[PDB]
Design a protein around this ligand. Sequence first.
Ligand SMILES: Cc1cc2nc3c(=O)[nH]c(=O)nc-3n(C[C@H](O)[C@H](O)[C@H](O)COP(=O)(O)OP(=O)(O)OC[C@H]3O[C@@H](n4cnc5c(N)ncnc54)[C@H](O)[C@@H]3O)c2cc1C
Length: 520
Amino acid sequence: IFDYVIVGGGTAGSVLANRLSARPENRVLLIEAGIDTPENNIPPEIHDGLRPWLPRLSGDKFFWPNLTIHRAAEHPGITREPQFYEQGRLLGGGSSVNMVVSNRGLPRDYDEWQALGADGWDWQGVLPYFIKTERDADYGDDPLHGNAGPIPIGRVDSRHWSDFTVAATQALEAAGLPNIHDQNARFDDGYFPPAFTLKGEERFSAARGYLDASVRVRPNLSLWTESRVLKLLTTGNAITGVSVLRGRETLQVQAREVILTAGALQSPAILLRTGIGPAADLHALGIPVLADRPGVGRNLWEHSSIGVVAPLTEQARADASSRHQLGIRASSGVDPATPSDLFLHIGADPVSGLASAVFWVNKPSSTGWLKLKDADPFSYPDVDFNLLSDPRDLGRLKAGLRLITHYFAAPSLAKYGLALALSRFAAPQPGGPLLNDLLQDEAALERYLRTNVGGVWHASGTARIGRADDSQAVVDKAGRVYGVTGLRVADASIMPTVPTANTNLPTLMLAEKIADAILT
Ligand SMILES: Cc1cc2nc3c(=O)[nH]c(=O)nc-3n(C[C@H](O)[C@H](O)[C@H](O)COP(=O)(O)OP(=O)(O)OC[C@H]3O[C@@H](n4cnc5c(N)ncnc54)[C@H](O)[C@@H]3O)c2cc1C
């Protein structure tokens, strides 16, 4: 009988398995559905940190196969297609297959968490957990940084920037933007070398960080790889264990405490199947109701993304002569409440022959939801990110595009004479209209955006921390699921809102914090 069964050996699951098992009396099982990634035998596609997009070139190999989602809000005169949503399926989860960038967001993100009912999750309260996770190679001795944590964070030196990146930076300075240097302790608009997590040229997932060999030899830690949890075992309103599929064999495992860390799309599907969710939905699926919690699978957040590409002209290609070089935090101007609501990257890829300015709404207004299609443990949920449902997000994307127009008009970048066209975010390519033309035609620009808006794999919020009297809350400040015993959620599902950040570093932090709450 395990004290803790942790379901999902991803970003959050890895931290929890490590921190909980640090006390020897704690018998802890970490169950991960995908392949193990032993530090001495990491798949070479995974292991290459300089080319972190490589896993997404192995098709399904490292993801949840055929996990499809709806992206944009349904809207008259557009037929939406389902879209494959990458989610890691292996030890380290998203941290094993992501683009290696590691940023925290803005104080205001977390102060809003507390304001929305997550007591002690304000900036003051999360910051120790950001410090504890990291070893910042550049600023680690400075006050808002850690120097001892398991996860390294570093940035390229600005002096190593390509002539192309420099030119972009001169363009941004011309618009009045500073180099803020450290996006993780400086929180106003400007540009910077992005903080990323690598070890030399190698990926450094949370499995490398939290589940190294010494941790693995702990007699009180069990690690089940290629093992899929199918159902939560209950008695009364108490979670009591898990049924797990290994080979063809299903096992029951008893547990004092189940902690779900199965990712923001699969953690709430597991709750819903257990009978924890909106009652009428569950009734509709013949699922007996443990707890009527209507926030389970609501409040699904993401960042809403788009691309601009241009063929590289000779000057630009010469100047563009792998690591994350440049990031831009900017304000759309669409809502006073949401400075720094846009993130942008400007760079060039001589390989595809494209210069790119890709960007997303980092502080969005739109949210969607996910539900079960049926009771089958094998089904994915029905997911609808509902992007651009709130018109402010459409406003933000248009603002971003104008900013790009403005920056590329600056002498430093206009000299290249790039003809910029719209593109999908995730695999940027030709085929979209010219930027200058679309910005001249508003309805056509609205239709394009609604049609081609993407995500940035920052799914979150589906089992939100909320106040103990909030009918729409799912978990309390320590991740305990309201209405049942024996169950916690401790992944990106619990974020009351997505931060102004890529979600990995915030997921590490929240797992450290939740581990602390448990150990305290
Ligand atoms: C392609 C991609 C690129 C990204 N780029 C970045 C980036 O550059 N920077 C950044 O900060 N964030 C980025 N993200 C997001 C970030 O990596 C995720 O938000 C983060 O990994 C979420 O962590 P988690 O623990 O919630 O989920 P995950 O790390 O996804 O972990 C969930 C784990 O649960 C396992 N699991 C699921 N269901 C079951 C089950 N029934 N049984 C057993 N195991 C199960 C999965 O196999 C997985 O290992 C990216 C994500 C993707 C997909």
